[PDB]
């Protein structure tokens, strides 16, 4: 009776495979709907207010990283306290 579970599993797998096939066809048409400009413009030759939002939130997320950094440093002190507890518990 073990054979039935594997075949039902593979039937669900191929159903999801067909769904994924059709959705990649959909997004392939969606990405291919817009291209006029060709390649070889892409090689890098040597010869507005959203940027304010980016600049202001970069240091806010860095400050959040530091604020959690002091907290996890305090937790590091706590875990260095707690690992010596079991070290000489007996």
Partner 1 sequence: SQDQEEIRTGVDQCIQKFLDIARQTECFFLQKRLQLSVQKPEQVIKEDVSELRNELQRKDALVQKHLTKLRHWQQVLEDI
Partner 2 sequence: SIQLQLNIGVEQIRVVHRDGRVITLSYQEQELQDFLLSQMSQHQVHAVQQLAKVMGWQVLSFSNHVGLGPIESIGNASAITVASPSGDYAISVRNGPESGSKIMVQFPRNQCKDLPKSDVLQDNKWSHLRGPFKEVQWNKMEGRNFVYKMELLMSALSPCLL
Instruction: Report the alpha-carbon distance of residue 56 to residue 49 in Å, rounded.
Output: 11
Tokens, residue 85? 């507890």
Instruction: Report the alpha-carbon distance of residue 25 to residue 36 in Å, rounded.
Output: 20
Interface residue with partner 1, options 1, 7, 29, 41 (CB under 8 A): 41
Euclidean distance between the first and the last CA atom of the chain, given in angstroms as a whole number = 54
Binding mask 49-88 for partner 1 (x = CB under 8 A): -xx-xx--x---x--x---x--------------------
Choose from partner 1, partner 2, none: what does 46 bind? Cβ within 5-8 Å by kind.
Answer: partner 2
Tell which residue, 39, 58, 61, 62, has the closest CA to residue 50. Answer: 58
Residues in contact with partner 1, total (CB under 8 A)?
Answer: 15
Q: Which residues bind partner 1 (CB under 8 A)?
A: 31, 35, 37, 39, 41-42, 44, 50-51, 53-54, 57, 61, 64, 68
């Amino acid at each position: 009776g073990t054979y039935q579970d594997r075949l039902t599993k593979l039937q669900d797998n191929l159903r999801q495979l067909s769904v994924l096939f059709r959705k990649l066809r959909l997004v392939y048409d969606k990405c291919n709907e817009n291209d006029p400009i060709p390649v070889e413009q892409l090689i890098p030759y040597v010869e507005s207010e959203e940027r304010r939002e980016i600049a202001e939130v970069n240091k806010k997320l860095k400050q959040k990283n530091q604020q959690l950094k002091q907290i996890m440093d305090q937790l590091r002190n706590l875990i260095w306290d707690i690992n010596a507890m079991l070290a000489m518990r007996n």
